[PDB]
Amino acid sequence: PPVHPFVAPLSYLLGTWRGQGEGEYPTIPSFRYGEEIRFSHSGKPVIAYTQKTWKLESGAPLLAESGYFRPRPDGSIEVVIACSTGLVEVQKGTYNVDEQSIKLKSDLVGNASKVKEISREFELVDGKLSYVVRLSTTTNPLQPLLKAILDKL
Amino acid sequence: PPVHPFVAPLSYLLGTWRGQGEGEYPTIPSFRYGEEIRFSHSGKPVIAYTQKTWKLESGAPLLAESGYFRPRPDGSIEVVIACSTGLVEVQKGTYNVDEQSIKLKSDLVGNASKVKEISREFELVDGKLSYVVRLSTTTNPLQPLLKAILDKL
Ligand SMILES: [Ba+2]
Ligand SMILES: [Ba+2]
Ligand SMILES: [Ba+2]
Ligand SMILES: [Ba+2]
Numbered sequence: 001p002p003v004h005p006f007v008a009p010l011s012y013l014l015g016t017w018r019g020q021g022e023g024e025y026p027t028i029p030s031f032r033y034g035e036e037i038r039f040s041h042s043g044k045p046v047i048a049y050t051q052k053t054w055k056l057e058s059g060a061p062l063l064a065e066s067g068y069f070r071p072r073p074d075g076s077i078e079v080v081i082a083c084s085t086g087l088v089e090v091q092k093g094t095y096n097v098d099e100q101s102i103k104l105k106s107d108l109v110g111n112a113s114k115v116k117e118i119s120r121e122f123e124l125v126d127g128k129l130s131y132v133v134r135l136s137t138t139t140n141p142l143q144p145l146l147k148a149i150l151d152k153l
Numbered sequence: 154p155p156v157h158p159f160v161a162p163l164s165y166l167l168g169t170w171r172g173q174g175e176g177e178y179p180t181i182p183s184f185r186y187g188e189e190i191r192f193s194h195s196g197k198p199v200i201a202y203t204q205k206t207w208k209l210e211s212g213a214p215l216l217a218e219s220g221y222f223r224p225r226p227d228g229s230i231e232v233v234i235a236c237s238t239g240l241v242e243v244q245k246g247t248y249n250v251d252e253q254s255i256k257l258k259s260d261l262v263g264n265a266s267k268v269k270e271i272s273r274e275f276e277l278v279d280g281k282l283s284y285v286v287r288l289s290t291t292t293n294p295l296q297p298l299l300k301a302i303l304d305k306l
Contacts (some may be wrong), residue, residue, distance in 0.1 A: 002244055007256065012230050028241070029194065034266075042214035042217075044214060044237070046237055046239070048217060048237075050219075060154065060196065061195035061196070063156070064195070064201065064221070066201075066203065066235065067219075067235045068217070068235055068236065068237050068239055070239045075234040077241055078264070080234040080235040080236065080240065080241050080263075081266065081288045082219060082220045082221060082234055082236055082241070083233060084197070084199050084201070084221045086221065086231060086233055087233070088220075088233050088234065088235060088240070088241035088242070088243060088263060088266045089263075090241055090263045096190060108241070108242060108261075108263040108264070110261045110263055111231070111233070111243050150279050151226070
């Protein structure tokens with residue numbers, strides 16, 4: 001199968017990325033994980049997304065996301081991500097093709113304990129995905145929580 | 154990595170299951186698609202899910218949907234999903250080891266125009282996974298929509 005036009009200006013994300021992150025909030029201290037994200041399509045105006053963390057040495061699986069990227073020509077995008085931890089999110093946002101990013105903020109966060117708003121940001125810096133999630137809780141304003149780098153499989 | 158005491162009651166679902174579905178609602182007549190389900194795990198208290206439909210001779214992509222199930226020992230189970238159309242469900246219900254059934258219903262259907270309720274149902278009928286879906290819109294009662302019969306692969 002071949003690419004559809006909506007998905008072709010984000011065709012660079014396509015494929016398997018692998019690296020490590022460092023999470024860290026005011027409420028918790030520096031912690032580090034490995035990461036694997038996959039980007040794909042069956043040529044609809046949608047990019048499938050699967051992510052997964054694991055503990056570095058062990059590394060027994062931690063967490064896992066799957067979700068779908070639906071981009072539009074106006075540079076608009078909407079992203080729906082499920083959580084193993086039991087979230088769903090409906091992230092609205094945009095993507096710019098010069099810089100090669102995506103940039104979202106949650107619109108609906110569901111089955112959210114104390115989670116107010118999450119804003120994810122996948123930009124290709126220097127050839128590698130640079131995947132940030134910022135977060136707000138019922139007690140802290142939005143700020144950088146995770147941050148992970150990765151390399152093309 | 155081991156099937157967690159919480160999950161192992163459901164272990165009869167683990168794996169990849171292929172078959173075909175059939176749609177029909179009062180506004181669309183009967184249809185037919187190929188369909189795969191796969192439940193996996195990673196030794197945590199969650200079964201992962203991923204599903205996809207094609208066109209029977211094409212077999213060209215229709216949709217995908219993927220989430221996470223959260224079984225609890227009590228009986229209660231909460232499901233998560235992000236769907237290809239670009240729609241999230243918080244699924245909520247109750248499984249049943251000996252009837253082999255998982256009856257769920259939506260406590261949050263996010264990013265939906267005209268969709269009001271959804272219920273899923275996975276059961277083992279005589280050897281194979283039946284997958285019955287039922288929907289209600291702005292204009293329709295909760296009536297069935299999709300029905301699939303899959304074969305453990
Ligand atoms: Ba343009
Ligand atoms: Ba850049
Ligand atoms: Ba019991
Ligand atoms: Ba039965």
